[PDB]
From a paper:
Holo‐[name] forms a trimer of homodimers, in which each monomer adopts an (α/β)8 triosephosphate isomerase (TIM) barrel fold. In total, holo‐[name] contains six equivalent active sites; each of which is formed from amino acids from two different domain‐swapped dimers. The transition from M2+ R to M2+ A,S is induced by bidentate substrate binding and occurs without a concomitant rearrangement of the protein scaffold.
In the absence of substrates, M2+ R constitutes the predominant state and the M2+ A,W complex was observed with lower occupancy in crystal structures of holo‐[name].
Residue numbers in the entry:
A (entry chain AAA), C (entry chain AAA), D (entry chain AAA): 1 to 250
B (entry chain BBB), E (entry chain BBB), F (entry chain BBB): 0 to 251
The structure:
């Protein structure tokens, strides 16, 4: 089963990691912690398909659901990741209902979508009964990260073939004319974020958000977000090294 | 146009270095840009092979730390290839005897001081036409002390002119002495052995380094007068940071 | 010369291999068998450009024509493969005449198409007279794998700049509401396949098909298909291992 | 600072290298010569993202500005390169004002463009004040390499968010019905090239051109081109080897 | 939390293993999910280097077979790096003497039983906090017997405590004895030599493995009481399958 | 179905070879298609590791030159893996003694002439069923002479039957003799030493090769009767060509 969908079905949110650093060793190590999922960022990172493919395997072995935040909402790219064992997709710049339908089209076989059939890794995980359960094995979230997406939230949330939305708050702040600060307190940004969550839940959809700290993630879980990521590997590692150096150098 | 670690030493100061077990260039550059004098890439207790180390050396140099490698083995050809790829410090495992220390030294210097083969693809680009005349000074070489035998042979190891000194691996020394392989071990016999190595190194006019798993332990080693202190592995730092973020996120 | 086009010019079909496993060693080994071509699948596989590039070289050295089935009908992706020495292209989801024209546009230099000039590997194979012969050095096939493509077959076959069509029968079955079974006996799927072949031949075009077995491939060659692939490396290897294990374990 | 923009601000053109061969060693070595920039060609080469990423680092270390000529004018591909430390972009097949606006959209954060925020490598080079200076850190040039682009030059040059244009003269010759000869003397091609330069300068924009020889590059610098590339690594290396062999074999 | 091969042995049963010469993770996982107890990655007669083996180990483990490696050489540092990357079985070539068998054993065990260096990046993730206390049991080590000399020295090789036993390479043994290097050779002198090795192994209370090129030969070796049987190389299986598909496709 | 270098020699002619320090297949194929008999991939003074050499061998073969490798070290297992990946010529560094020359020879020949392990993944594809009967002739092996010791031992090195001859590294020989490591050195003592090696090689009925940094120096070495001449490294040729293009572009 998809571990995130299991969380949801059991009435709990999912907490996920966020990787911008390529490689399998930290991917497995973080998957073995109390993360339900680990997202590999293929957008704001140097991680290409060749490097993502073994990382999916490593996260699955470590016992978290492997997710990818893609560089673009492109059906063929998403299909190839699904067939490589990405079991969650977070697609950037879903700004309109039509773009959300384009995301949905990639996530489902005919007749619900147009996903091409050749499920190399999912058929190894799920066996020959995969086709009947395929749609449920994948979680799909549309990114909300622009003014336009915010304006079109209800129309995006009307698309049956997506699970919900994923807020990209640094990009949303920037597009609203504010600083792209992680875990921002900017009142209009905080209000927009709450509005997206409320609309998603009203529409019977799931809502996620990207976080830069455990404390902000605790607040988002308390507010009812269904999928909360915290925090990027590179940021956590940089901050840890700075502290080690300060401690060493007195 | 100088080895940053050697510049620290020429000012009578220690060098503090990072320690990478995760392949890739992005964290390598980001950590090199911090207040580390060097960043060591571990090619022993990691999945980092030559193909992955090569671009990491470039990234560390661009970030402004001296690129170092802890090799999988004290093998002259492996070390030479790393030098020609722009490793400017070498930490070689399991140097247990004077002869093994001479083997390390042989790789680090052109004839007549050593037997290093000539083809310095990346050092020639960094140092330019002045390279060959200063080549030995551009590289730091440290012999690992991680066994009972190495401890018994410390003075003979330190007598080898062509190495700068020694690098203590405390976890492996504890395990070889019959203790648990603890990170930042303070096992009494291990502690005594380490103090002996540092005393002998400085008596010989050589440098002594040590691996640390924490900023706190590194601070103590710096206070004890170690010349080269590493802290802490990228993977360990990242794992611990993620565990803490998760605990904070899931807190009541 | 392109070995597939030589087959056609000499009045014989081409039989091709089908690789979903990255790497050069099996690619060369299979190219040295009595295959006229070897197709590298960049869609239902983990094979990215970095891994396809040496495989093209290895197939050419082994003495088969290197082909690629791309992840998408994208002109720039196809051009880069041509310049890396892919000498056949099979493009997915060609559903309309306009999509088939998009495929043709990538396969020909101006004035016939819009292919960008910088033929790194073809200029090494063919020399400075490459430009005059370039179009003939490449075989281009549009995939027919949807209901819509079937409905638009005559309009797709009207596009001068493609050699013909390549049936993807598992996807076609699925899109027709049937199980995506390899080498299917499903009557409507079998009928649709024969209809595509007959239309292609009537239009003076070539037709290919993907097969999962030697026996099915024998039948397709007998029915007159011009390009028959059999069978995917991973499927053949899995089946061989299962048999070895059954034999060993008694 | 971007070394090319420094040249321009100081009233001098930039001379750049041109790499079609993957790898970091020649990239650094050439960057250390008296090149202001080095362009990595991701179009007419086997260089994919995985191979370009370390090459950007190596060129920057060698002391030239790292540029990329992309396979396609795609915003998400361009963004990922920017975040990997490409500080110049040359985008193919900019044939219309709308296509030039698509290029501009990728090069600037909101409100000027729609660039997604997560500047992994530029934030290491430029620090936390990167956002305010981001646009100036990147040079963007639209390729002019078709009849249509030539016809639409004034409309392309009207787009505020691009620095100017980059002529691809082999493709331009081919699209005008001539041989795709490097450094051509063909009168209509030479005239078209001069016309693009004059229009660019009249519009207060920059103009670049691709060259195959030092002698042709000297003439283009004398004619006033702002960005001149000379010559591709593979071509220079092949010619050098041919000469070594002729000398050795007498 | 157990080595699948060792569990077979603790039940008095042989293990059957796959054999990979093709790099990549997809077939590695797919074959591991079959009724193989282990999958051996051949790093000797293949183009598989460390960078390619590392993700394959992960894929085999996920598929549910024990990941094994046949190394290019009996070199302790190479073997240690593979162990720390999650190779849980090692087959080392050209073990011709007791001293070479001791060299293999030295790599597989921490002090005091061996000299394995401490940094178990992947085994610590698989086994958790219980790892170090069981580390030796988590790994299987087999010395290859592939020469006349190894055959003469079989009893001394089998006397080395820290190896589980031996792995016969019949094609190389045939070639070294002066015969054609046939796959699944049945050359009479070779057959006799192999039976001698297996008898001596079991007399010593050790395990004996053998490489096979076919299911049929593997079935015989299992019947003869071999403890570890490999069958058959991915490349050979794939090539033969493709030849048969082509013959079927081109048949009248 | 023949080694192009050996065919040159069987016609009483020298072979001219390229020399690659840059990884990648595109220039490798392009240079192989020129009038080079062989292309040597340098795995010593380069960043080319096994994973990168493997596809380069394929590319050189397709381009129509014989693929050769100058290894990082004279190690039999490394050499065997390269042979099985389709390296058809081996140039091994630091062959200083007859015993080291025997070590090189051991890797290049199956039993009984050598100890090469059997698994010829790529040579079996190139040569087909006729491979094993001709295997030794398909490979050329040259021992590098680059030290004072090697020069003193030249006759004993040349007495080893299983090597085709020697390959002189003039820059490293100059450095080991106490001179500057100049490319195409003409240092008088170095020049004398090189002439001695070539005379001894031909006296022994063996082949003698030499590394060159220029077409002009290669022409002289061909005139002096060397059997295998390399010229010139890809990186050096490319750098010099780019410097000249820049000087032409920036000229008044
Ligand atoms: Br945790
Ligand atoms: Br809408
Ligand atoms: Br810091
Ligand atoms: Br066949
Ligand atoms: Br239509
Ligand atoms: Br210059
Ligand atoms: Br327009
Ligand atoms: Br099975
Ligand atoms: Br030539
Ligand atoms: K978990
Ligand atoms: K620093
Ligand atoms: K063939
Ligand atoms: K420069
Ligand atoms: K299994
Ligand atoms: K040639
Ligand atoms: Mg399809
Ligand atoms: Mg040398
Ligand atoms: Mg173009
Ligand atoms: Mg964004
Ligand atoms: Mg150790
Ligand atoms: Mg063997």
């Amino acid at each position: 089963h998809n571990k995130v969908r299991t969380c949801w079905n059991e009435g709990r949110p999912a907490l996920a990691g966020w990787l911008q650093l390529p490689g399998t060793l930290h991917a497995e190590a973080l998957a073995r912690l109390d993360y339900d999922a680990v997202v590999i960022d293929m957008q704001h990172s140097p991680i290409d398909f060749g490097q993502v493919a073994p990382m999916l395997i490593a996260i699955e072995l470590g016992g978290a659901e492997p997710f990818v935040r893609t560089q673009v909402n492109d059906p063929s790219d998403i299909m190839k990741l699904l067939d490589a064992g990405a079991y969650g997709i977070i697609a950037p710049m879903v700004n309109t209902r039509a773009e959300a339908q384009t995301l949905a089209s990639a996530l489902h076989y005919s007749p619900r979508g147009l996903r091409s059939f050749g499920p190399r890794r999912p058929s190894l995980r799920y066996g020959s009964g995969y086709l009947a359960q395929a749609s449920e094995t994948v979680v799909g979230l549309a990114m909300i990260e622009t003014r336009e997406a915010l304006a079109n939230i209800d129309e995006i949330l009307s698309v049956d073939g997506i699970d919900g939305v994923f807020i990209g708050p640094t990009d949303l702040a920037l597009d609203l004319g504010h600083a792209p600060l992680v875990d921002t307190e900017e009142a209009e940004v905080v209000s927009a974020i709450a509005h997206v969550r409320e609309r998603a839940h009203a529409a019977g959809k799931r809502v996620g958000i990207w976080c830069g700290s455990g404390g902000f993630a605790r607040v988002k879980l308390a507010e009812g977000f269904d999928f909360v990521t915290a925090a990027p590997d590179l940021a956590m590692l940089s901050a840890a090294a700075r502290q080690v150096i300060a401690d060493a150098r007195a």
